[model samples]
Target chain A: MPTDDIVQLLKGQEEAWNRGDLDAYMQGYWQNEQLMLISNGKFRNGWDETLAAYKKNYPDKESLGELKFTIKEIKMLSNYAAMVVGRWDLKRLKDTPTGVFTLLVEKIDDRWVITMDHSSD
Target chain B: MPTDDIVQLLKGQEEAWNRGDLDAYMQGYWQNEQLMLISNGKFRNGWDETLAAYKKNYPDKESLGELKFTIKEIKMLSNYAAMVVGRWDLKRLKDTPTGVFTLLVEKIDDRWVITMDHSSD
Candidate 1:
């Protein structure tokens, strides 16, 4: 996938997450079955575990809230690889929380999917 | 530069920083004269300012101390671009301060130079 396409895919994932669609949000990840997600200093391996973690943390729309992304930088390493560093903000009616996210994405089988995602607060 | 070369360059930078060689450490950056650096959420533009900031913060070997990097992930976006997300630890004699650093590097003029670096605590 092209760099622009990858950026678009990430934006779509953010939209899905904001809509509280865990299934759709997970689609942006590589389904290699060995996908890795590191969040809050804990490593969660495999697709099932990744999905489960998201569901556990964001079970409903209220918890998911509206997600906004401020992409600090995007570097295109190659046609197949790219890195996106950004800040994600979850804005609710009562409060807002933001964290920095670094996603390493690969173009696998014509689809840009996140191979590793590390999010920190 | 190849991906391996870029990684090696980064390692050399860590070494230079650890040894408190600010001049050698700054060599890894593009000499575009418009280089930009973001630290502690403030943007420092131009090469002199960047060097000055470093000098002010790390004036001596004792303050620079030992720098260690735990590279969590590196994604090659293209032959010219790469994104590196890693944790940096400053181990001084008294305390250890750690933070996450996401660097967007580009291969310019046969050198892998940092285009944008965002560091967070």
Candidate 2:
């Protein structure tokens, strides 16, 4: 079971994203070379690749719109493990696409960071 | 971080659900007097109430069908903490309603149990 503090960590990620701060948005993830992300049906390995993918797609501040999450559930597997399932909505000027995501977060050095992230349309 | 065994614990819950055994299905929960579950739009508290809710809605074996999960992400928070986000599908003889859920689980006494669960359509 994860510490309840994971919620605050994820909430920070959302705030950073809404602010169009890619660097801040990426802070929720493990920054090691082994970090991995699955997006749009493809796997991107390493922290750099993951950051590059986001930077390439969003490109500019306008592309990163306001973010909101409808958290459906949060489970603490133990003092150190928790799972979150929610729908993420990016409210942009022209479009809004909602995707559901399941995240497994781990605490490293008392900080909750995402070890794996997979998102889809 | 939560022990990786949490996945196996949840998997067992899913399997028990498929078997149409409400008792088994309820085993995934903390069983403590404080266990909580949110379904539809109501917050049900305590193990008995939570178990009663499932038995009332599902009612019988036919309502509990085969279960499958689409895991969007899972992160290990620490040696004792991890988080999971996923979508759930139930295939029955007729009709299927897919809902997303987020759960927070905690390990107590070496057993991974759900401390908080919220689900919605």
Give the poorly placed runs of model 2, Cα more than 4 Å off.
A1-15, A32-49, A68-91, A94-112, A116-121, B1-8, B32-49, B68-91, B94-105, B116-121
TM-scores vs. true structure, each candidate:
0.76, 0.57
Interface Cα RMSD in Å, per prediction: 4.7, 8.5
Q: Candidate 2, residue B90: CA error in Å? A: 4.2
How high is the TM-score of chain B in model 1?
Answer: 0.90
Question: What is the C-alpha lDDT profile of model 2 across A1-121, one tens digit per residue?
Answer: 2445777777888899988899998888888876655443344567787788888898888778888877766766555545666667888888987776656666678887876655544
Report lDDT (Cα) of residue B117, candidate 2: 61
| Top-TM-score structure, candidate number | 1
Task: List the candidate 1 regions with Cα displacement exceeding 4 Å.
Answer: A1-4, A33-46, A72-75, B1-4, B32-48, B72-78, B83-85
lDDT of 1 by residue, A6-115 (tens): 77887898889877799998899998666866665345668777888778887676678888888866766677777777778878889888776777788899888898
